[PDB]
Amino acid sequence: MTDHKALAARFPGDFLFGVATASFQIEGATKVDGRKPSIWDAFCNMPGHVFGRHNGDVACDHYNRWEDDLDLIKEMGVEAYRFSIAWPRIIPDGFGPINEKGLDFYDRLVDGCKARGIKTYATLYHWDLPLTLMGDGGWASRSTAHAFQRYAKTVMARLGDRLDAVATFNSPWCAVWLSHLYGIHAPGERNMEAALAAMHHINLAHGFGVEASRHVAPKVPVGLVLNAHSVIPASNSDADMKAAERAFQFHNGAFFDPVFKGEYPAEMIEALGSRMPVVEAEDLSIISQKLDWWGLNYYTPMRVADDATEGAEFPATKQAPAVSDVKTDIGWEVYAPALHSLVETLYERYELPDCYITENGACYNMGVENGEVDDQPRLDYYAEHLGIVADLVKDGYPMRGYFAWSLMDNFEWAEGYRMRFGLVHVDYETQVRTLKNSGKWYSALASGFPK
Amino acid sequence: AYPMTDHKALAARFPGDFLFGVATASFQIEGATKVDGRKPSIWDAFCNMPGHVFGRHNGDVACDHYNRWEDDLDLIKEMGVEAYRFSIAWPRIIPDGFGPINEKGLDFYDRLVDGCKARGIKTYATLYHWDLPLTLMGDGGWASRSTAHAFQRYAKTVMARLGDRLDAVATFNSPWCAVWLSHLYGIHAPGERNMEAALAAMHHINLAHGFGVEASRHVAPKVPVGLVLNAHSVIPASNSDADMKAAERAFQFHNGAFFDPVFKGEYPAEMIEALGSRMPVVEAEDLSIISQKLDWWGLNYYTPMRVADDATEGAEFPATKQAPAVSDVKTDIGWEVYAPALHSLVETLYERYELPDCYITENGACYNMGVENGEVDDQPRLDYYAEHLGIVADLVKDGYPMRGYFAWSLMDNFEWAEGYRMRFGLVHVDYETQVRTLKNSGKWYSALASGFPK
Ligand SMILES: O=C(O)c1ccccc1O[C@@H]1O[C@@H](CO)[C@H](O)[C@H](O)[C@H]1O
Ligand SMILES: O=C(O)c1ccccc1O[C@@H]1O[C@@H](CO)[C@H](O)[C@H](O)[C@H]1O
Numbered sequence: 066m067t068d069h070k071a072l073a074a075r076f077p078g079d080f081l082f083g084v085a086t087a088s089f090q091i092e093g094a095t096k097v098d099g100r101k102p103s104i105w106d107a108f109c110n111m112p113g114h115v116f117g118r119h120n121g122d123v124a125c126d127h128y129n130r131w132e133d134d135l136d137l138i139k140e141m142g143v144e145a146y147r148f149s150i151a152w153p154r155i156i157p158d159g160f161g162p163i164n165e166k167g168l169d170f171y172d173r174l175v176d177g178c179k180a181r182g183i184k185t186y187a188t189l190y191h192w193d194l195p196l197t198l199m200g201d202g203g204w205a206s207r208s209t210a211h212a213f214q215r216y217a218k219t220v221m222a223r224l225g226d227r228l229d230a231v232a233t234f235n236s237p238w239c240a241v242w243l244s245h246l247y248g249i250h251a252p253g254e255r256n257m258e259a260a261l262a263a264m265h266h267i268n269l270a271h272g273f274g275v276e277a278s279r280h281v282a283p284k285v286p287v288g289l290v291l292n293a294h295s296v297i298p299a300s301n302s303d304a305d306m307k308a309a310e311r312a313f314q315f316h317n318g319a320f321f322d323p324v325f326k327g328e329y330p331a332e333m334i335e336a337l338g339s340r341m342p343v344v345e346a347e348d349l350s351i352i353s354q355k356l357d358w359w360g361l362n363y364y365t366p367m368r369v370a371d372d373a374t375e376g377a378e379f380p381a382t383k384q385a386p387a388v389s390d391v392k393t394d395i396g397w398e399v400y401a402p403a404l405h406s407l408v409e410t411l412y413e414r415y416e417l418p419d420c421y422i423t424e425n426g427a428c429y430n431m432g433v434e435n436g437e438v439d440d441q442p443r444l445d446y447y448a449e450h451l452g453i454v455a456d457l458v459k460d461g462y463p464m465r466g467y468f469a470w471s472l473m474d475n476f477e478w479a480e481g482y483r484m485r486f487g488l489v490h491v492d493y494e495t496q497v498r499t500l501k502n503s504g505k506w507y508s509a510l511a512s513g514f515p516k
Numbered sequence: 517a518y519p520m521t522d523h524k525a526l527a528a529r530f531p532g533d534f535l536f537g538v539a540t541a542s543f544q545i546e547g548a549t550k551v552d553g554r555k556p557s558i559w560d561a562f563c564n565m566p567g568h569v570f571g572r573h574n575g576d577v578a579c580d581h582y583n584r585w586e587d588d589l590d591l592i593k594e595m596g597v598e599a600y601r602f603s604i605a606w607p608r609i610i611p612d613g614f615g616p617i618n619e620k621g622l623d624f625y626d627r628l629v630d631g632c633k634a635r636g637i638k639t640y641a642t643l644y645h646w647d648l649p650l651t652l653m654g655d656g657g658w659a660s661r662s663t664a665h666a667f668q669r670y671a672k673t674v675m676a677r678l679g680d681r682l683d684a685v686a687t688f689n690s691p692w693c694a695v696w697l698s699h700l701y702g703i704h705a706p707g708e709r710n711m712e713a714a715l716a717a718m719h720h721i722n723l724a725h726g727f728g729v730e731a732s733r734h735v736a737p738k739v740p741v742g743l744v745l746n747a748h749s750v751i752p753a754s755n756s757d758a759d760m761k762a763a764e765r766a767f768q769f770h771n772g773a774f775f776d777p778v779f780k781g782e783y784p785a786e787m788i789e790a791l792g793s794r795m796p797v798v799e800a801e802d803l804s805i806i807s808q809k810l811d812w813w814g815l816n817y818y819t820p821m822r823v824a825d826d827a828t829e830g831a832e833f834p835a836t837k838q839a840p841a842v843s844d845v846k847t848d849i850g851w852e853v854y855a856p857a858l859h860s861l862v863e864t865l866y867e868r869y870e871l872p873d874c875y876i877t878e879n880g881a882c883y884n885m886g887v888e889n890g891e892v893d894d895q896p897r898l899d900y901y902a903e904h905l906g907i908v909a910d911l912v913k914d915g916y917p918m919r920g921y922f923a924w925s926l927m928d929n930f931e932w933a934e935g936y937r938m939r940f941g942l943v944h945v946d947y948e949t950q951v952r953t954l955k956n957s958g959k960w961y962s963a964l965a966s967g968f969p970k
Contacts, residue, residue, distance in 0.1 A: 110654070110657075112656075197650065
């Protein structure tokens with residue numbers, strides 16, 4: 066289980082261990098140095114969308130504290146840091162003039178990492194769309210993909226000489242369905258037409274980003290970060306099994322199929338295709354450019370059952386109950402085997418590049434007692450899932466690295482600051498960072514690498 | 517006694533100094549949404565996001581009034597109509613809501629008002645007709661008290677430039693729409709459905725109105741200040757004690773939310789009992805600022821709001837449901853035509869509230885006929901005007917201070933969630949050619965209005 070020296074023995078000597086973070090979740094300084102609002106600033110500040118109307122004005126104050134945070138990462142002995150770049154700082158209206166002050170912040174951040182021997186994994190888009198782009202229709206408008214194309218080039222032109230890796234998007238599933246169909250994330254739409262348009266334009270923007278990054282910075286390996294869902298049927302009935310496949314096509318295939326097969330899932334196209342935006346002739350060629358790596362985000366299985374309610378929109382599924390009785394403080398089922406079956410399914414179904422676990426972590430809300438944080442269930446979560454990752458390596462899968470999700474407690478989207486995911490406790494009143502016991506344990510594991 | 521046109525008989529019923537006008541709104545007619553420093557409004561975003569507006573129609577082109585304004589003023593002049601009521605685009609004047617003033621934006625309305633003065637057309641400006649700068653959504657939009665101060669500063673900036681020539685100014689057009697329809701019902705931008713959001717919008721728009729009144733008089737004390745409201749004509753389904761109570765709750769929520777703070781310096785009591793706990797912070801000076809004396813007010817009327825008690829358990833205040841229509845006549849947008857509801861509404865308001873002079877700022881009808889042989893035969897629109905103008909003349913006879921009337925829609929235009937499909941104009945616009953064609957209703961209105969001032 067939790068014996069780190071024994072766990073470490075199961076990984077190759079060149080395995081990459083990392084910690085990860087996202088711009089709006091930690092940075093604060095929302096109106097500083099030319100930054101303009103993102104769709105999340107708007108979402109937060111409109112009553113109804115976010116717990117307690119919590120916003121990102123301060124968060125972890127990382128914009129000002131970035132040096133201490135980097136020193137913390139070095140002191141933990143962690144080889145890699147994955148962060149996202151705030152489009153609203155770089156090109157504040159989305160289109161329009163470049164904010165060189167904005168590029169400067171990430172320019173210094175990357176330099177600080179280089180000096181400290183910390184490998185840099187940058188994500189171009191982790192949900193903070195500049196608000197002004199909503200004027201054109203946001204992700205529902207194709208022009209937004211070209212705004213992204215230009216943004217991608219702008220960032221890589223400045224950073225591409227030092228970045229160890231880059232990912233275009235993190236979790237299209239959230240930016241697409243959760244944001245435009247379910248109304249849970251910004252901009253909070255609930256419309257199938259809007260969502261399908263967002264779907265294609267995000268896929269297209271990804272393809273634009275790959276291309277742009279390679280024209281300016283060909284040495285930098287390009288990736289895409291996806292929260293692929295481990296879809297588990299409620300039963301072995303034909304009904305529930307056919308449900309599981311429809312769910313897979315809609316929740317995963319909507320992104321994996323275009324990127325890795327250069328097509329949309331056919332059954333999904335039959336049901337939803339007529340409400341999709343224009344797909345120009347070169348679109349799927351651009352979307353399906355070969356990647357150097359991909360990032361898997363995993364937390365919990367997606368248990369589905371057939372939903373035979375009349376007129377139900379594709380995929381016509383409903384939530385099946387948790388088999389495990391272990392749950393995190395946000396209520397997510399803990400079931401590590403669903404990570405093994407997921408990776409197994411994906412590598413059978415698609416031609417994938419090397420894989421990095423880019424997010425895996427757990428919500429537990431204990432704070433500081435006697436200068437320490439006893440977050441044993443988080444420690445246990447990492448041990449179990451890292452064990453699975455080690456199994457996958459054994460089984461022959463190209464698992465090259467693992468990023469622990471959440472360097473520190475932060476703004477957790479619709480949950481506000483109530484749900485803590487970090488390895489490092491952050492006291493929001495004092496901004497004091499406190500390494501948790503899970504973090505001390507992860508640091509012990511990671512410190513031994515590379516061997 | 518010999519035959520007389522209806523417009524001449526009608527004209528005899530109005531006092532010699534009655535004011536006749538036509539009216540428009542900036543986003544509905546201007547187009548040119550990305551020139552001369554304009555940044556997007558919440559309606560640009562609403563239009564372009566699939567699901568909110570018919571056909572995803574937007575305001576990019578509209579009637580191209582930004583470029584054809586002189587021709588449109590000439591049309592007004594030729595119609596012999598005394599007054600022009602228009603709105604000013606905040607996204608043109610202060611593109612980010614807060615931030616640098618866009619002089620180019622101000623220049624447009626500066627030249628427009630000069631063109632009206634040069635033509636002898638009286639100018640009635642509306643400062644806000646729903647086109648909030650998109651950037652203000654970053655702070656929460658109308659749900660944030662700061663937005664009220666952003667409006668305040670915008671109002672001041674506008675009036676400092678135009679105040680020497682404007683005949684009247686209204687701060688807002690239809691709070692009901694910007695508040696409930698936009699933040700509770702989800703039908704208008706920004707399309708929220710949240711009571712907490714709506715109550716914040718409610719108070720901050722009431723507050724912004726008061727700020728605007730003070731700002732306008734500070735820098736242009738000569739200009740008469742008003743507020744334009746779509747007061748709903750609430751008609752109970754019956755005189756049962758239960759429907760009667762429903763009608764009063766409906767009145768408090770749909771009208772009193774705005775009339776009580778503005779004209780009585782307080783919110784309706786039963787509404788507070790049900791909703792007060794979810795309202796934003798009301799500071800010490802708020803209601804005295806909101807309730808400043810006005811020089812006039814504008815009534816928007818189209819159709820009645822017929823209500824019955826809604827016994828649905830747990831129903832949110834005011835807990836009413838739609839009651840059946842009495843007339844079977846409807847416009848092409850589906851609204852009951854029922855002119856006497858205008859009479860009972862003005863009666864009700866003048867007995868409940870201490871109100872200044874009244875101008876009918878919007879009255880009109882959706883009918884969609886186009887051009888045939890150079891003409892638009894829109895007799896049902898003409899009949900709507902003649903009948904409602906008869907009600908207005910009746911209200912004058914009955915002792916109410918009705919000082920003027922603006923026919924709503926000078927021209928066919930962008931109709932919000934309906935897009936360009938619903939035509940409200942006295943002037944037809946062919947959206948392919950941008951050709952204006954004065955309709956038969958418009959020629960009739962022109963013949964009436966030209967006689968004034970007598
Ligand atoms: O945000 C969600 O609701 C979500 C749900 C399922 C799978 C992934 C999700 O997003 C990741 O989880 C977040 C936890 O709140 C993290 O903060 C990450 O930022 C994010 O990438
Ligand atoms: O949109 C409504 O449901 C509404 C209802 C009652 C009173 C006014 C209303 O909006 C006004 O009517 C518009 C017609 O589409 C006009 O074009 C005006 O611009 C607007 O002020």
